[PDB]
Amino acid sequence: CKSPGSSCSKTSYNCCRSCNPYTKRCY
Numbered sequence: 001c002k003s004p005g006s007s008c009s010k011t012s013y014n015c016c017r018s019c020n021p022y023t024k025r026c027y
Contacts, residue, residue: 002026
């Protein structure tokens with residue numbers, strides 16, 4: 001996956017945790 005704060009987005013589900021669209025980063 002990516003970091004638990006990696007700059008994800010809406011389609012980026014590469015977070016082992018999840019993607020926060022408020023921070024555009026993973027929770």
